[PDB]
Protein backbone atom coordinates (compact mmCIF):
# COMPACT_ATOMS: atom_id res chain seq x y z
CA UNK A 1 0.00 0.00 0.00
CA UNK A 2 0.73 3.60 -0.52
CA UNK A 3 3.01 5.00 2.48
CA UNK A 4 5.13 8.54 2.98
CA UNK A 5 8.67 8.10 4.46
CA UNK A 6 10.26 11.27 4.91
CA UNK A 7 9.35 13.64 2.31
CA UNK A 8 9.18 11.13 -0.60
CA UNK A 9 6.05 8.50 -1.51
CA UNK A 10 6.61 4.74 -1.78
CA UNK A 11 4.58 4.09 -4.92
CA UNK A 12 3.58 0.23 -4.83
CA UNK A 13 4.29 -1.71 -7.61
CA UNK A 14 1.53 -1.82 -10.21
CA UNK A 15 0.91 -1.07 -13.63
CA UNK A 16 -0.64 1.95 -15.61
CA UNK A 17 -1.56 3.22 -18.97
CA UNK A 18 1.13 5.68 -20.04
CA UNK A 19 1.33 8.26 -22.96
CA UNK A 20 -1.43 10.26 -24.16
CA UNK A 21 -3.31 10.87 -27.53
CA UNK A 22 -3.94 14.32 -27.56
CA UNK A 23 -5.29 15.59 -30.74
CA UNK A 24 -2.43 18.99 -30.88
CA UNK A 25 0.18 16.29 -29.64
CA UNK A 26 3.67 17.29 -31.80
CA UNK A 27 3.91 14.15 -33.16
CA UNK A 28 8.01 14.76 -32.81
CA UNK A 29 7.48 14.20 -29.08
CA UNK A 30 6.01 10.70 -29.38
CA UNK A 31 3.41 11.15 -26.39
CA UNK A 32 2.00 7.86 -27.95
CA UNK A 33 1.15 5.38 -28.23
CA UNK A 34 -0.70 4.71 -24.90
CA UNK A 35 0.79 2.00 -23.78
CA UNK A 36 0.34 -0.62 -20.37
CA UNK A 37 3.60 -0.35 -18.07
CA UNK A 38 4.57 -1.82 -14.93
CA UNK A 39 6.75 -1.17 -12.59
CA UNK A 40 8.02 -2.18 -9.16
CA UNK A 41 7.54 0.21 -6.25
CA UNK A 42 9.76 2.75 -6.12
CA UNK A 43 9.91 6.23 -3.69
CA UNK A 44 9.72 9.72 -5.23
CA UNK A 45 10.27 13.16 -3.51
CA UNK A 46 6.55 14.97 -3.05
CA UNK A 47 8.73 17.83 -4.13
CA UNK A 48 10.39 19.09 -6.16
CA UNK A 49 14.29 20.19 -5.13
CA UNK A 50 13.75 23.34 -3.46
CA UNK A 51 16.51 26.17 -3.62
CA UNK A 52 17.21 25.82 0.54
CA UNK A 53 18.07 21.94 -0.40
CA UNK A 54 20.30 22.89 -3.33
CA UNK A 55 21.80 25.28 -0.99
CA UNK A 56 23.30 22.53 1.42
CA UNK A 57 24.31 20.80 -0.94
CA UNK A 58 26.09 22.78 -2.10
CA UNK A 59 27.52 24.18 1.02
CA UNK A 60 28.48 20.65 1.93
CA UNK A 61 30.11 19.63 -1.35
CA UNK A 62 31.32 23.01 -2.95
CA UNK A 63 29.47 21.57 -6.08
CA UNK A 64 29.57 24.25 -8.72
CA UNK A 65 27.15 23.83 -11.60
CA UNK A 66 27.63 23.76 -15.67
CA UNK A 67 25.86 26.82 -15.77
CA UNK A 68 28.75 28.60 -13.58
CA UNK A 69 31.29 26.41 -15.51
CA UNK A 70 30.05 28.17 -18.86
CA UNK A 71 29.05 31.66 -17.65
CA UNK A 72 25.11 31.67 -18.52
CA UNK A 73 22.05 30.03 -18.62
CA UNK A 74 19.03 30.75 -20.28
CA UNK A 75 16.13 33.51 -18.86
CA UNK A 76 12.61 34.13 -20.30
CA UNK A 77 13.09 37.31 -21.61
CA UNK A 78 10.13 39.60 -19.07
CA UNK A 79 12.08 38.59 -16.25
CA UNK A 80 15.53 40.14 -17.20
CA UNK A 81 18.14 33.73 -28.38
CA UNK A 82 17.11 30.36 -30.23
CA UNK A 83 15.33 31.16 -33.13
CA UNK A 84 12.52 28.80 -32.52
CA UNK A 85 11.97 30.28 -28.90
CA UNK A 86 12.75 33.90 -29.34
CA UNK A 87 11.55 34.50 -25.72
CA UNK A 88 14.70 32.65 -23.73
CA UNK A 89 17.93 34.92 -23.61
CA UNK A 90 21.47 33.63 -22.59
CA UNK A 91 21.96 35.61 -19.75
CA UNK A 92 25.77 36.03 -18.35
CA UNK A 93 25.74 35.26 -14.32
CA UNK A 94 22.16 33.57 -14.60
CA UNK A 95 22.90 30.62 -12.29
CA UNK A 96 20.69 28.93 -9.59
CA UNK A 97 21.55 31.74 -6.70
CA UNK A 98 20.89 34.72 -9.25
CA UNK A 99 17.91 33.24 -11.06
CA UNK A 100 17.25 36.36 -13.64
CA UNK A 101 21.25 37.07 -13.89
CA UNK A 102 23.15 39.88 -12.44
CA UNK A 103 20.66 41.78 -9.84
CA UNK A 104 18.58 38.90 -8.96
CA UNK A 105 18.66 36.70 -5.80
CA UNK A 106 17.17 33.74 -4.38
CA UNK A 107 16.59 35.06 -0.73
CA UNK A 108 12.75 35.22 -0.79
CA UNK A 109 12.25 31.86 -3.02
CA UNK A 110 13.95 29.88 0.04
CA UNK A 111 11.07 26.38 -0.57
CA UNK A 112 10.58 27.84 -4.94
CA UNK A 113 12.44 25.03 -7.28
CA UNK A 114 15.80 25.00 -7.64
CA UNK A 115 16.26 26.24 -11.14
CA UNK A 116 19.18 26.62 -13.35
CA UNK A 117 20.30 23.47 -12.67
CA UNK A 118 21.31 21.03 -16.02
CA UNK A 119 21.11 17.03 -15.82
CA UNK A 120 24.57 16.47 -14.38
CA UNK A 121 23.88 19.19 -11.61
CA UNK A 122 20.58 17.40 -10.92
CA UNK A 123 22.43 13.66 -10.80
CA UNK A 124 25.01 15.08 -8.83
CA UNK A 125 22.76 16.65 -5.89
CA UNK A 126 20.78 13.29 -6.02
CA UNK A 127 24.03 11.16 -5.68
CA UNK A 128 24.82 13.31 -2.39
CA UNK A 129 21.46 12.91 -1.87
CA UNK A 130 21.79 8.69 -1.26
CA UNK A 131 18.87 9.17 -4.55
CA UNK A 132 18.59 8.93 -8.48
CA UNK A 133 16.43 10.44 -10.92
CA UNK A 134 13.29 8.86 -11.20
CA UNK A 135 12.71 6.85 -14.47
CA UNK A 136 10.10 8.95 -17.02
CA UNK A 137 7.77 5.87 -16.55
CA UNK A 138 8.08 6.50 -12.85
CA UNK A 139 8.17 9.96 -12.80
CA UNK A 140 4.52 9.88 -14.82
CA UNK A 141 3.17 7.00 -12.82
CA UNK A 142 3.51 8.79 -9.40
CA UNK A 143 2.47 12.39 -11.07
CA UNK A 144 -0.82 10.75 -12.49
CA UNK A 145 -1.91 9.77 -8.99
CA UNK A 146 -3.76 6.75 -9.71
CA UNK A 147 -5.99 8.04 -11.92
CA UNK A 148 -6.18 6.43 -15.67
CA UNK A 149 -5.36 8.21 -18.75
CA UNK A 150 -6.57 11.48 -17.59
CA UNK A 151 -5.30 14.90 -18.72
CA UNK A 152 -3.77 16.58 -15.79
CA UNK A 153 -2.60 15.28 -12.36
CA UNK A 154 -6.41 15.75 -10.82
CA UNK A 155 -8.23 15.01 -13.79
CA UNK A 156 -9.54 16.01 -17.75
CA UNK A 157 -10.27 19.93 -16.19
CA UNK A 158 -7.76 22.58 -15.78
CA UNK A 159 -9.20 24.46 -13.60
CA UNK A 160 -12.00 22.15 -11.48
CA UNK A 161 -14.44 24.44 -9.88
CA UNK A 162 -12.26 27.22 -11.59
CA UNK A 163 -9.68 26.94 -8.72
CA UNK A 164 -6.03 26.48 -9.92
CA UNK A 165 -3.95 23.89 -9.66
CA UNK A 166 -0.62 24.17 -10.84
CA UNK A 167 1.65 27.17 -11.69
CA UNK A 168 1.44 27.75 -15.42
CA UNK A 169 0.78 30.67 -17.78
CA UNK A 170 -2.64 32.84 -17.88
CA UNK A 171 -2.85 36.09 -20.33
CA UNK A 172 -1.55 36.34 -23.77
CA UNK A 173 2.13 34.41 -24.37
CA UNK A 174 4.71 35.59 -24.16
CA UNK A 175 3.72 39.67 -23.46
CA UNK A 176 1.54 39.21 -20.23
CA UNK A 177 1.40 37.07 -17.84
CA UNK A 178 -1.47 38.03 -15.76
CA UNK A 179 -0.65 35.78 -12.87
CA UNK A 180 -4.60 34.46 -11.84
CA UNK A 181 -2.91 31.34 -10.57
CA UNK A 182 -1.33 33.48 -8.17
CA UNK A 183 2.68 33.43 -9.92
CA UNK A 184 4.24 34.95 -12.31
CA UNK A 185 7.68 33.01 -11.98
CA UNK A 186 7.86 30.00 -9.65
CA UNK A 187 5.93 28.81 -6.74
CA UNK A 188 6.87 27.25 -3.84
CA UNK A 189 7.30 23.54 -4.16
CA UNK A 190 4.86 23.32 -1.71
CA UNK A 191 2.19 25.14 -3.65
CA UNK A 192 -1.49 23.88 -5.08
CA UNK A 193 -3.02 20.81 -3.97
CA UNK A 194 -1.37 17.45 -4.26
CA UNK A 195 -2.52 14.74 -6.30
CA UNK A 196 -3.86 11.19 -5.32
CA UNK A 197 -0.22 10.20 -4.10
CA UNK A 198 0.92 13.32 -2.21
CA UNK A 199 3.56 14.69 -5.00
CA UNK A 200 3.26 18.68 -5.37
CA UNK A 201 3.38 20.47 -8.71
CA UNK A 202 4.22 17.63 -10.97
CA UNK A 203 1.91 19.62 -13.39
CA UNK A 204 3.59 23.51 -14.34
CA UNK A 205 6.12 25.09 -12.20
CA UNK A 206 9.44 23.56 -13.70
CA UNK A 207 10.24 20.90 -15.51
CA UNK A 208 11.84 18.35 -14.15
CA UNK A 209 14.68 16.32 -15.41
CA UNK A 210 14.14 12.55 -15.70
CA UNK A 211 16.98 9.24 -16.22
CA UNK A 212 16.07 8.61 -19.28
CA UNK A 213 17.67 8.82 -22.68
CA UNK A 214 14.94 11.16 -24.87
CA UNK A 215 13.66 9.45 -27.53
CA UNK A 216 10.06 10.20 -29.79
CA UNK A 217 9.52 6.12 -30.69
CA UNK A 218 11.75 3.51 -28.57
CA UNK A 219 8.80 3.00 -26.81
CA UNK A 220 6.34 2.83 -29.67
CA UNK A 221 6.87 -0.90 -29.55
CA UNK A 222 5.72 -3.59 -27.64
CA UNK A 223 8.16 -5.71 -25.77
CA UNK A 224 9.66 -6.24 -22.08
CA UNK A 225 12.24 -3.47 -22.27
CA UNK A 226 9.60 -0.87 -22.93
CA UNK A 227 6.56 -2.21 -20.99
CA UNK A 228 8.19 -3.37 -17.76
CA UNK A 229 10.62 -1.11 -15.86
CA UNK A 230 11.12 0.54 -18.89
CA UNK A 231 14.32 2.74 -18.88
CA UNK A 232 14.55 4.26 -22.28
CA UNK A 233 17.27 3.90 -25.33
CA UNK A 234 20.29 2.84 -24.57
CA UNK A 235 22.32 6.22 -25.35
CA UNK A 236 21.15 9.43 -26.49
CA UNK A 237 21.30 12.96 -26.91
CA UNK A 238 19.32 14.63 -24.59
CA UNK A 239 17.74 13.46 -21.51
CA UNK A 240 13.85 13.62 -21.05
CA UNK A 241 12.38 16.36 -18.97
CA UNK A 242 8.52 16.45 -17.63
CA UNK A 243 5.57 18.27 -16.43
CA UNK A 244 5.65 21.48 -17.80
CA UNK A 245 6.48 24.71 -16.11
CA UNK A 246 5.22 28.28 -14.71
CA UNK A 247 5.82 29.66 -18.43
CA UNK A 248 3.51 26.62 -20.36
CA UNK A 249 0.23 27.30 -22.61
CA UNK A 250 -2.06 25.87 -24.17
CA UNK A 251 -1.57 28.81 -27.34
CA UNK A 252 2.16 27.63 -28.23
CA UNK A 253 3.22 24.42 -26.43
CA UNK A 254 0.17 22.98 -24.42
CA UNK A 255 2.86 20.91 -22.60
CA UNK A 256 1.63 21.41 -19.32
CA UNK A 257 -0.78 17.31 -19.69
CA UNK A 258 0.56 15.11 -17.65
CA UNK A 259 1.57 12.63 -20.75
CA UNK A 260 3.47 15.70 -22.35
CA UNK A 261 7.23 15.32 -22.59
CA UNK A 262 10.79 17.39 -23.96
CA UNK A 263 13.97 16.89 -23.71
CA UNK A 264 17.21 19.20 -23.31
CA UNK A 265 21.23 18.07 -23.33
CA UNK A 266 22.32 17.30 -20.02
CA UNK A 267 24.36 20.24 -19.85
CA UNK A 268 22.08 22.60 -20.44
CA UNK A 269 20.14 24.81 -18.01
CA UNK A 270 17.19 26.90 -17.98
CA UNK A 271 15.11 29.38 -15.83
CA UNK A 272 12.16 26.80 -15.63
CA UNK A 273 13.57 23.07 -15.23
CA UNK A 274 14.45 21.74 -12.30
CA UNK A 275 14.32 18.05 -10.72
CA UNK A 276 12.80 16.03 -7.97
CA UNK A 277 14.93 12.60 -6.92
CA UNK A 278 13.21 9.27 -6.59
CA UNK A 279 14.75 6.05 -5.00
CA UNK A 280 14.42 2.53 -4.36
CA UNK A 281 13.09 0.72 -1.38
CA1 LIG B 1 1.52 31.27 -13.18
CA1 LIG C 1 6.47 20.21 -13.11
Same mark, same amino acid.
Given at each position: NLYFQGHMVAIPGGTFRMG +? $?? #?????????? %?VRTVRLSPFLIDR @???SNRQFAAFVKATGYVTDAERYGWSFVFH?? *??? #? $?? %???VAV %??? @????PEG %????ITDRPNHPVVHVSWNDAVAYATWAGKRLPTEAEWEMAARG +? /?????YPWGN $? /?? &?????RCNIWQG?? &???????????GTAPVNAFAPNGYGL?????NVWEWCADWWSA???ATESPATRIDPRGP?? +?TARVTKGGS?????? @???? @?? *?AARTCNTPDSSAAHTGFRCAADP
Open positions: +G $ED #PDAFPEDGEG %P @YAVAH *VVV #P $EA %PWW %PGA @YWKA %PGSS +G /LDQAR $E /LT &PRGRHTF &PVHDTGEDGYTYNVAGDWHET +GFLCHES @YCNR @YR *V
